[PDB]
Design a protein around this ligand. Structure first.
Ligand SMILES: Nc1ncnc2c1ncn2[C@@H]1O[C@H](COP(=O)(O)OP(=O)(O)OP(=O)(O)O)[C@@H](O)[C@H]1O
Ligand SMILES: Nc1ncnc2c1ncn2[C@@H]1O[C@H](COP(=O)(O)OP(=O)(O)OP(=O)(O)O)[C@@H](O)[C@H]1O
Ligand SMILES: [K+]
Ligand SMILES: [K+]
Ligand SMILES: [K+]
Ligand SMILES: [K+]
Ligand SMILES: [Mg+2]
Ligand SMILES: [Mg+2]
Ligand SMILES: [Mg+2]
Ligand SMILES: [Mg+2]
Ligand SMILES: [Mg+2]
Ligand SMILES: [Mg+2]
Ligand SMILES: [Mg+2]
Ligand SMILES: [Mg+2]
Ligand SMILES: [Mg+2]
Ligand SMILES: [Mg+2]
Ligand SMILES: [Mg+2]
Ligand SMILES: [Mg+2]
Ligand SMILES: [Mg+2]
Ligand SMILES: [Mg+2]
Ligand SMILES: [Mg+2]
Ligand SMILES: [Mg+2]
Ligand SMILES: [Mg+2]
Ligand SMILES: [Mg+2]
Ligand SMILES: [Mg+2]
Ligand SMILES: [Mg+2]
Ligand SMILES: [Mg+2]
Ligand SMILES: [Mg+2]
Ligand SMILES: [Mg+2]
Ligand SMILES: [Mg+2]
Ligand SMILES: [Mg+2]
Ligand SMILES: [Mg+2]
Ligand SMILES: [Mg+2]
Lengths: 495, 48
RNA sequence: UACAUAGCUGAUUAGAGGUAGACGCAGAGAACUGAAACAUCUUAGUACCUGCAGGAAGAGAAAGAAAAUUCGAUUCCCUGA
RNA sequence: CCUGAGUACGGCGGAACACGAGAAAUUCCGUCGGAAUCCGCGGGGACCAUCCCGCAAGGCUAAAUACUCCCUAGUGACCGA
RNA sequence: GAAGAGACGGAGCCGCAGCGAAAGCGAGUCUGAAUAGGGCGAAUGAGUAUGUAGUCGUAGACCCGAAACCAUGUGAUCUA
RNA sequence: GGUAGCGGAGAAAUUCCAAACGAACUUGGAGAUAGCUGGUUCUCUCCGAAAUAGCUUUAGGGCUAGCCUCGGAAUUGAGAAUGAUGGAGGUAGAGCACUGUUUGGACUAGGGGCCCAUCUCGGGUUACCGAAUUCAGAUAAACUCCGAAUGCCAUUCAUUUA
RNA sequence: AAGCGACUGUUUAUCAAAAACACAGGUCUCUGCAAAAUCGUAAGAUGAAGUAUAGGGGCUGACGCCUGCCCGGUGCUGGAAGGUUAAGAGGAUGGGUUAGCUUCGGCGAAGCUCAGAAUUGAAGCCCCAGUAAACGGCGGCCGUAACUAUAACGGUCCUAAG
RNA sequence: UGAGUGUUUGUACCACAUGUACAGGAUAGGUAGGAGCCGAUGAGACCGGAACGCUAGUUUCGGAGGAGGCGCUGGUGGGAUACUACCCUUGUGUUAUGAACCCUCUAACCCGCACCACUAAUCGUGGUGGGAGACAGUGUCAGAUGGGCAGUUUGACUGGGGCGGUCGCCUCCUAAAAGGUAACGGAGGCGCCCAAAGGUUCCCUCAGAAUGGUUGGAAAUCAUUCGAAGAGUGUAAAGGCAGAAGGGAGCUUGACUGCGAGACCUACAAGUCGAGCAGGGACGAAAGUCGGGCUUAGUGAUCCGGUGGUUCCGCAUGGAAGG
RNA sequence: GUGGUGGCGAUAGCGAGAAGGAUACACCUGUUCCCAUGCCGAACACAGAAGUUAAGCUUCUUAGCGCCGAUUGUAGUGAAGGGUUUCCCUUUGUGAGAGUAGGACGUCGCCACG
RNA sequence: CGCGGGGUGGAGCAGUCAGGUAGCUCGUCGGGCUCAUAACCCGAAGGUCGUAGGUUCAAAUCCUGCCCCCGCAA
RNA sequence: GGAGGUAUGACAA
């Protein structure tokens, strides 16, 4: 597999997402493919499929599979949509799902009734069923739990031939992956090693860049100073060609040509020094290209007297009296974070739906908000967002400036604000949702997997901010380390 | 941003025209009804 | 170092060296110059040096030139240009 | 049965071929690797097939060609201290 | 064949047909879808060999004149 | 006696290496190169310039055009000058009709204080400073309501020459 | 009486005798012996017919009192995990051709040939530490006292250090 | 520059084992057969250990045992077992091979190590010991370092030169009523934008002032009158435009293809305008306008490479390479 | 006489004032249809003919505004000269702008109807 | 008149390159602790970043000017 | 019971 002189930009783009890429991999490498949000990972996988108009050249002679598969008829049954996408063996899929954790009764439900967990797990079953094709695996571990990730890593270690995946999940790629493509800012890189190695070497590169820049800045300032001083000296010598009209005899000067010659030599020193400074600036201009320039975040937390913001009492919840988890009682006070956890399909989003009253199932038990409580909300199902941002921020009563501010702080370049939410990457749509939440003045925050389709930098931003402000929050995550860093009030719902 | 552009006859796949456009104001792939002298008719010329 | 070889001695055999400040084979091999600067390139495989020489040398009887089914070993002049 | 083996050829590095690596055939030097032999081998300007031409890796070979320190006989719209 | 003139020697050179990148066509050709128009050409026509003079090019090229560069060699009887 | 020039020696100065060493001397390449200075030899006759544009790692050099000379050629004699006629053109001048600058006066929005009234609300005056309008007066290379003399282009127009 | 150099010496043959050079002394650094360094294509030689109290190189320059801070940068020394890192080995695949198939299209074995991947592949670079008698470097602003001035003192920013 | 051992192992054979989804008698590898098949050639089936492992178990090793057995048929499951083979993933071994790496050997190479001889010789050549040793050295190729050394470069304009500034393009003045015209003379701009800011058809006319009116002011927006341009014309200045080039709304894409008489400017290279013809269209009823914008800046040679097309060529032929 | 439609540098116009509708042009009554008004049958478009020409539109007066515009004289200036030469003067020839006298409230046609 | 470097709460400073909505330390003010003062602790105030405009969704930051300060010149 | 060793606080009054 070879990329030769590839250049590419979507029709919307001002700039080049790729500019003369020149690389070579094969079907044997266990390859990771990493980068921030909006760099071209999914785009590049499509270009490997030849699904878009690649300028330059691409060489391959191998059949591909892209996870997630593109699906229609989200109303119809899961078995129907899966047969429509790719035929398979029902029992083989049962085996894969039961090595994972979900009952095949999900197959004979509609495809949207599932959670993202079971969606992901089932399409990964479809992946695993295929044998000959070359896996392209775009963000598999998102919407997934420890057991699923463990079994998936087991499968991928057992994997004889090669594959490609996009993760954002450091430990997960470190377990399995050998080679790494890295779509850095302004260029592209290929290493042999895991994401930890990539971290180390990129830190070294950044250190070198910054140090060399500081050297150049210091030296150029020095040389500019010296140039100015030599220049003033020359001018003072040119002043000797002439005398003073106030005092007699000062003129009648002889060999002004030699005077001017020597002054010219001094100016020529000044100019040599300036040219050196210019060359050093030219060296400077090659620097600071693969950096991120990380930034903090903000949060419009607006508390009130309500020290009790949510209560739950004996809440047993489910569909058709197949009650989905044992009854629970708990509470969310002010400045307190609560980590609601469990397996996939354990009923967490169902609990959120019972709170916000849009639960189409069976309820027994109590759940009480406060009187005039304001919610901010980050859901697991943000597909519904559509259109421009100047219209999104009108549908959702926001400040457009604070909105785009929080977006750029999350790491979206301002070339992207002209795009449409249909066009943006899933990470960028996720950033739109998070920026909505952060911009909404609210008193309780309800976060249903904010951490899926984001970057490590975004993970760090969110952790630092939530640990700095410590607002009242409900949280749902499978990144157990994050919940360890933040919360102690952890609550594991289960059947 | 403002870029010089070769259009192209969708049938002949022949370029036949040079033009200009924004990417901000004209992000979608531009199209016109222009003459293809190889066909000696008018045809949908699409940017490439 | 025993067999012997080296070594030593004696008889033999043929080389040395310079010409012709000219010609020709080989080895090694410049720069000024020209390119209006200059580095590739040019001057130039020239000058210089060295070796081998002979009256000439060198090349030389096709694992060729062509496209004609054809010319029949090299060398040199004209021409191709 | 024989018909010129560390050879032709190839890789790397360099040269000469009008041909400056260029699409670079052909020839030669260094280095390393490394064939078959008559149903065979090389060339015909990358290269493959067909056709044609030739049969390397061993040697010699006069003549036409270049030059004059010199010898003889001489010549000049060459010189005349 | 007097160091000759001259004879022989038609291989080759120029011109007589050009147009086009070329295939190729041909007083036409190329561009062009094109009998269009336009360009280059023909019907308008004269060249060639030698001599001679002016001029140009390659050769030192009009005469003198550098500092300098390179390659042999000679010099420590001066002085270190 | 030894060290020899892409070098040697140097108690080190660019110093000495056969009477001038930032790289000896000699021979050859070699008649180096010189957009640089100097020179370039007999006569007469005909005609007779330029020192300008453009481009130039170009500016004291060069190339093309311009200006000169010589030969041929043809063309409704085009060329030159003067007159008549008709045109383009906005200059000197003049003017303020626009754009700017600007003087004095009438009036004045508005801006200053002083006092009464103060919720700082409404005035009344220094002939207080004064937009803007208007009267009169000025001004201009980058102002023109106007606008020449000249010069320019052209006339199967005329005259005279070539 | 003062400056320079400690001294005796050497120095620009032919404009400079000196405060310049050397000097003993000091310090740093290299070198275990076929030394290191140097001349030279190499042999060979000096070093040395020596052997770390010897030799070479750099700086300073008798003697006396001293020789402060800085290893952030440039070098050097040592180190080493990781990434990257040439030729070479490696040979996957892809074009060109064509025996043969074809359905005209087109496909295409073997061989040959043109490009040649993955993998492997040293020093070095990125990195850690040390090193300044190694290269080199050694700050600003603001106030602050019972006359006034001034600031023992304080604050602040940067620095590798001030 | 060869003799080994060992390790990491690559490949290839050949023998070994190990295959637990869920439910399910239960640790079900796929496939077909499959209801037969095994046992004193030691059954049923117990004991200790070993491997793996999902920790449920499978198998084997050894001990006891001394006679029986496994499954069918049927239930769940996609698939039911026993047993036969075709076997397939995974990881153990034998052997042959290929590399990399460490140590060991000595027989190549080497010793400014000793002794002997040539020999009177601190050379050298040999011989015998000893040491190191397939390293070094040398050759070829490649990477890093390399002023130790070499060959070279290091603009012009310019009121001397140098700095500053400038170098290409557009507009005005200078510029002397055609055109042109210089200065290190005066002032400014450009290195783009627009998919409608183009085209066509239809329609419209601005700026400001006065008056009045609510927030609403000095001034938004509304209405009348005054209103000749005092506005606007994407972007600088000049020229011009209210018969619009300004403004608005429909339909489109002529911001077409091949061209082009003839003129302007011009040293050359270039630049500018262009009626009109042909094809095929847009708008409009039609006339008729449309080969970008309001006019003038928004740009740069050749060489060299890249992309697409081509009825061009293809070193004897067909192709291909390459043009 | 009115209406339409053209040419001539508005000497044509702008303002003010008077009268008229015979036909005519106009206003005018509406939205029934073609069609239309980023709102409105105001404008566009359509149909009609109760009413008034008040307005617009015609004809007349007005020299207030604007337009045209001499003659004279001057400035400037070509050519030829002079001087006391950043300027000034003389001869000849041409000759403005301004300021006026004055003109000017239209001229020439074609067509339909009365 | 020009060339460099500066104008960020009371002082000193970042942030300016890279627009993301003003911060570090000290100081001031208030209240606590203390017999009282300092230190310490808890609070607050003080700047649209010299200024008038543009660009932008958004300017201390980018652009254009204008006004002051320190060096040179002058 | 006893011996030797093992932070700030004006001046004067
Ligand atoms: N269809 C599209 N049209 C236009 N722009 C797009 C389109 N899809 C993606 N982009 C833009 O291209 C860039 C890369 O998007 P892409 O989907 O490749 O991201 P990614 O590498 O997968 O990142 P992420 O972590 O968000 O998944 C982003 O700026 C995104 O907005
Ligand atoms: N409409 C529905 N009808 C029936 N079952 C449903 C329906 N919606 C959801 N479920 C089931 O409810 C369970 C949990 O659903 P829920 O959306 O709450 O999951 P979750 O907690 O968000 O899970 P995950 O970790 O996968 O995101 C799953 O088994 C899912 O199949
Ligand atoms: K030179
Ligand atoms: K011979
Ligand atoms: K070749
Ligand atoms: K250091
Ligand atoms: Mg993606
Ligand atoms: Mg969920
Ligand atoms: Mg030259
Ligand atoms: Mg060959
Ligand atoms: Mg070879
Ligand atoms: Mg003589
Ligand atoms: Mg005589
Ligand atoms: Mg030299
Ligand atoms: Mg001597
Ligand atoms: Mg000196
Ligand atoms: Mg020569
Ligand atoms: Mg004037
Ligand atoms: Mg003194
Ligand atoms: Mg002394
Ligand atoms: Mg003395
Ligand atoms: Mg002397
Ligand atoms: Mg000293
Ligand atoms: Mg020795
Ligand atoms: Mg040098
Ligand atoms: Mg040279
Ligand atoms: Mg100069
Ligand atoms: Mg000057
Ligand atoms: Mg003019
Ligand atoms: Mg051929
Ligand atoms: Mg051929
Ligand atoms: Mg007049
Ligand atoms: Mg206090």
């Amino acid at each position: 597999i070879e990329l030769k002189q590839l250049s590419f930009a979507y029709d919307n783009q001002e700039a080049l997402l790729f500019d003369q890429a020149n690389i070579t991999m094969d079907t044997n490498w266990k390859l990771g493919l990493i980068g921030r949000n909006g760099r071209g990972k999914t785009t590049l996988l499509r270009l490997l499929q030849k699904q878009l108009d690649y300028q330059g050249e691409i060489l391959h002679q191998v059949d591909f599979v892209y996870f997630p598969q593109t699906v229609a008829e989200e109303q119809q049954l899961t078995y129907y949509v899966l047969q429509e996408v790719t035929s398979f063996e029902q029992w083989k899929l049962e085996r894969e799902l039961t090595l994972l954790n979900v009952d095949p009764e999900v197959l004979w439900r509609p495809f949207s009734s599932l959670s993202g967990g079971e969606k992901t797990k089932v399409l990964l079953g479809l992946l695993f069923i295929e044998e000959n094709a070359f896996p392209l695996i775009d963000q598999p571990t998102n919407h997934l739990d420890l057991a699923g990730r463990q079994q998936v890593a087991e499968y991928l270690k057992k994997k004889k031939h090669g594959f490609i995946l996009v993760s954002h999940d450091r430990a997960f790629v470190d377990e399995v992956v050998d080679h790494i493509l890295a779509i850095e800012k302004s260029q592209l890189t290929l290493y042999q090693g895991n994401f930890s190695i990539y971290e180390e070497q990129k830190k070294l590169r950044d250190a070198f860049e910054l140090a060399e820049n500081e050297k150049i800045k210091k030296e150029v300032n020095r040389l500019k100073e010296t140039a100015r001083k030599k220049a003033e000296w020359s001018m003072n010598r040119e002043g000797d060609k002439y005398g003073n009209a106030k005092e007699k005899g000062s003129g009648a000067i002889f060999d002004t040509g030699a005077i001017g010659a020597r002054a010219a030599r001094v100016m020529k020193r000044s100019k040599h020094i300036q040219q050196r400074a210019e060359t050093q600036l030219a060296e400077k201009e090659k620097l600071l290209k693969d950096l991120e320039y990380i930034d903090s975040l903000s949060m419009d937390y607006q508390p009130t007297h309500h020290k009790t913001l949510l209560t739950v009492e004996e809440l047993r919840l489910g569909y058709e009296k197949n009650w989905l988890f044992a009854p629970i009682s708990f509470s969310i006070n002010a400045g307190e974070i609560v980590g609601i956890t469990g397996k996939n399909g354990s009923g967490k989003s169902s609990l959120i739906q019972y709170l916000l009253d849009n639960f189409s199932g069976d309820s027994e038990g109590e759940a009480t908000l406060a009187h005039q409580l304001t919610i901010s909300y980050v859901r697991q199902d943000y597909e519904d967002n559509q259109g421009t941002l100047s219209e999104f921020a009108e549908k959702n009563q926001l400040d457009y400036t604070q909105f785009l501010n929080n977006l750029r702080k999350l790491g979206m370049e301002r070339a992207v604000f002209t795009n449409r939410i249909e066009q943006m990457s899933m990470g960028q749509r996720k950033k739109v949702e998070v920026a909505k939440s952060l911009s909404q003045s609210a008193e309780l925050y309800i976060w249903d997997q904010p951490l899926n389709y984001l970057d490590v930098f975004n993970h760090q931003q969110l952790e630092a901010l939530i640990l700095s402000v410590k607002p009242a929050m409900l949280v749902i995550e499978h990144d157990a380390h994050f919940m360890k860093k933040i919360t102690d009030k952890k609550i594991v719902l289960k059947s | 941003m403002r870029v010089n552009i070769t259009l192209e006859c969708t049938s002949c796949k022949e370029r036949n025209y040079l033009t200009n456009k924004n990417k901000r104001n004209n992000p979608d792939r531009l199209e016109k009804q222009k003459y293809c002298p190889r066909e000696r008719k008018v045809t949908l010329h699409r940017e490439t």
